Design a protein around this ligand. Structure first.
Ligand code: GXG
Ligand code: MG
Ligand code: MG
Ligand code: MG
Length: 716
């Protein structure tokens, strides 16, 4: 009695009102025509959506039976691959082709740099992420472990000048490495001037210019005493702020106050694995934040926080130009699996959620194409949607047809809605060229979502035998081939200069020294973007793109074929391998990370949490990391590595530790000692004990059911 009838649909009133009162005004779309289009698109495309999900089940059943029907020691790769071809899992590779996607912004086609992912249901996080286009290097260095807290350089309640001077020195070296002087070092600079459109750096006994004056991009203030100096390197901007009257500037030999880095070039506003949204009320919260971002007027509490305006500069010659102040925004829709009762049909059947996301996030994104102040997002006229968890090229073609039909409902030009393709399921990996071809006129990135991909690896081969420990997965042959294969397919499809080639998330949110040391591997592998968990991590990962010329790396990689199908298909089976203490560590680690994530998901609707692991390393958890942990334990239980008593005792042992870590939140409900009274604890148990039975190992069916159950209990 809380719904609105439109054709065969029954729409939750909160969603109907949100769309009519907030999303539609200003788009010139007729409300009656919009809702008729929703009815028609749902009716027309739901059968194919269901057909595709049934096809996954039929293929996995055949693969399950194949492994159970054999006894031979190692996979006979020739027989295995021929079988995958017969059942239509491995499809033929199409001829070479070049993508044709047009109307894409420079941040995607050309600029190499970090890409930030943030939960769209958290307005203050989403605001900080959009504002992360520019970030302080001094803050990122001083506040993290990139500068070690050795004797004398420790962080305290007040500024430590010994630490501050290490920060300054680190940044001066970065400047020398990125925008080198004709002679001397930035460490010895005493001042900056702009004379006849050229930057002049004062040294103690002479003056000098840049080795490449073309890296001088502009300044603020008067040319003869600028307030800042703007530089560019590998397409990314660097700004030296000059203020001798500041706390840090007073100590600096040139009065430098900070070094600002262009950081999160693009940001993915996430409706998928980092949020918990199980009904119309939840979906409206997310849609309204996405609306505020595109209209430019989102403002969050704690005083209030707003979106940054663009940045004004004087060109080296003399004109006034402007640089984007905000990250270019993508939105990650949900994939093809789930339904959501935000809309039900006349029989009470829930509507597919990915279909709804395309309609509603596409509608809302129109506001980002028009004046807010200037328009917020795409100046070239595109809407950028990340589509996750697709399995193979028919599922990509379906997304493209869904987008085409939504463009018609919205009165948008065909191919306005672009697609960032996650390569995060095995049947996409091994058919990647065909997947890109299916979206050849819409694709704006491919990205190795390696954590979902690991979950799919385990589930697909669940019946083959026990898998290696999850920490071993990152170095197994299949995943190394998968990473190279993805780059190869992108470059061969003409992505250089046209679309992003992306790699995955750094999850250790406090291990920033390790990130700076290690994550450089991604641009060295030819990735023009990769995922960071925070604005601070975006600023630090920006350093890697100044050190690595990704454009040159991609040109050197052109034409290579560095992964075979046999390599891609190498299942991560454990050899005949573990002492009891290693098995116990794996179980306790997986149970602790499952419980820490799931308890905040089910009881508080939080879809991404920092959860310390068994080694007290803080990890950003979302559904993909949960998918790995629950599938690994399900696999170990399936093949006798551990018993059902092992699992239960581990969960009961780790649950009170998770309770302790959450003891300060008035909204937290402890799981122990009354485990069977905690919907959250039972959800975590169900994710393991029923994991082998979930479709492709997905965690949403259980999580959504258990969160809805919790909401009902809290309302009675
Ligand atoms: O690798 C994949 O499948 C992803 O898609 C990555 C992802 O959501 C994510 C994650 F796993 C941990 C933290 C933050 C995130 F955004
Ligand atoms: Mg994923
Ligand atoms: Mg260079
Ligand atoms: Mg199954």
């Amino acid at each position: 009695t809380d719904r609105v009838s439109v054709g065969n649909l029954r729409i939750a009133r909160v969603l109907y009102d949100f769309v009519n009162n907030e999303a539609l005004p200003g788009t010139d779309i007729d409300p009656d025509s919009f809702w008729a289009g929703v009815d028609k698109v749902v009716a027309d495309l739901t059968p194919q959506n269901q057909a595709l999900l049934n096809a996954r089940d039929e293929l996995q059943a055949q693969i399950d039976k194949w492994h159970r029907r054999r006894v031979i020691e190692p996979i006979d790769m020739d027989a295995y691959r021929q079988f995958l071809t017969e059942i239509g899992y491995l499809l033929p590779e199409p001829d070479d082709f070049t993508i044709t996607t047009s109307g894409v912004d420079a941040e995607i086609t050309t600029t190499a740099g970090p890409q930030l992912v943030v939960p769209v249901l958290n307005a203050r996080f989403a605001l900080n992420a959009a504002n992360a286009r520019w970030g302080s290097l001094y803050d990122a260095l001083y506040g993290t472990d990139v500068i070690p807290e050795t004797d004398g350089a420790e962080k305290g309640p007040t500024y430590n000048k010994v630490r501050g001077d290490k920060v300054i020195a680190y940044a001066r070296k970065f400047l020398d490495d990125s925008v080198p002087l004709s002679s001397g070092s930035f460490g010895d600079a005493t001042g900056f001037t702009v004379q006849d459109g050229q930057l002049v750096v004062a040294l103690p006994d002479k003056s000098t210019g840049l080795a490449n004056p073309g890296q001088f991009a502009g300044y603020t203030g008067a040319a003869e005493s600028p307030t800042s100096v703007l530089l560019i390197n590998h397409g990314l901007h660097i700004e030296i702020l000059i203020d001798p009257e500041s706390q840090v500037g007073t100590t600096d030999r040139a009065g430098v106050k900070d070094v600002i880095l262009e950081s999160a070039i693009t940001t993915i506003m996430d409706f998928e694995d980092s949020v918990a949204a199980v009904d119309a009320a939840d979906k409206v919260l997310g849609y309204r934040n996405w609306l505020g971002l595109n209209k430019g007027d989102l403002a969050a509490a704690v005083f209030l926080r707003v979106l940054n305006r663009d940045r004004n500069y004087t060109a080296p010659g003399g004109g006034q130009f402007t640089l984007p102040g905000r990250s270019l925004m993508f939105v990650r829709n949900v994939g093809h699996l789930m339904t959501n009762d935000a809309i039900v049909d006349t029989d009470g059947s829930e509507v597919f959620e990915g279909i709804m996301d395309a309609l509603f996030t596409g509608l809302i994104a129109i506001h980002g194409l028009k004046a807010s102040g200037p328009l917020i997002n795409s100046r070239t006229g595109s809407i950028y949607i990340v589509k996750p968890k697709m399995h193979g090229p028919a599922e990509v073609a379906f997304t493209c047809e869904l987008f085409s039909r939504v463009e018609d409902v919205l009165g948008l030009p065909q191919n306005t809605m672009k697609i960032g393709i996650m390569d995060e399921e095995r049947r996409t990996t091994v058919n990647l060229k065909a997947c890109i071809k299916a979206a050849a006129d819409r694709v704006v990135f491919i990205n190795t979502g390696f954590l979902d991909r690991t979950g799919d690896e385990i589930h697909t081969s669940m019946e083959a035998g026990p898998m290696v420990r999850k920490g071993t997965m990152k170095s197994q042959p299949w995943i190394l081939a998968y990473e190279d294969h993805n780059v190869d397919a992108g470059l061969a499809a003409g992505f250089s200069g046209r679309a992003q080639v992306g790699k995955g998330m750094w999850t250790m949110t406090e291990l920033m020294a390790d990130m700076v040391e290690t994550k450089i591997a991604q641009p060295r592998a030819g990735a023009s973007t990769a995922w960071v968990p925070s604005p601070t991590a975006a600023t630090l990962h920006a350093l890697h793109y100044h050190q690595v010329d990704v454009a040159a790396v991609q040109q050197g990689l052109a034409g290579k074929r560095r992964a075979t199908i046999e390599q891609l298909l190498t299942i991560p089976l454990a050899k005949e391998a573990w002492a009891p203490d290693e098995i116990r560590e794996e179980v306790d680690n997986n149970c602790q990370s499952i419980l820490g994530y799931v308890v905040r998901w089910v009881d508080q609707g939080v879809g991404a949490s920092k959860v310390p692991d068994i080694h007290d390393v803080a990890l950003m958890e979302d559904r993909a990391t949960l998918r790995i942990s629950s599938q690994l334990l399900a696999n170990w239980l399936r093949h006798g590595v551990i018993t059902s008593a092992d699992v239960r005792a581990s969960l009961e042992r780790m649950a009170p530790l998770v309770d302790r870590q959450n003891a300060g939140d008035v909204a937290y409900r402890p799981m122990a000692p009354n485990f069977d009274d905690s919907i959250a604890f039972l959800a975590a148990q169900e994710l393991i004990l029923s994991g082998a039975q979930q479709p492709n190992g997905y965690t949403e069916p259980i999580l959504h059911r258990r969160r809805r159950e919790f909401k009902a209990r809290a309302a009675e």
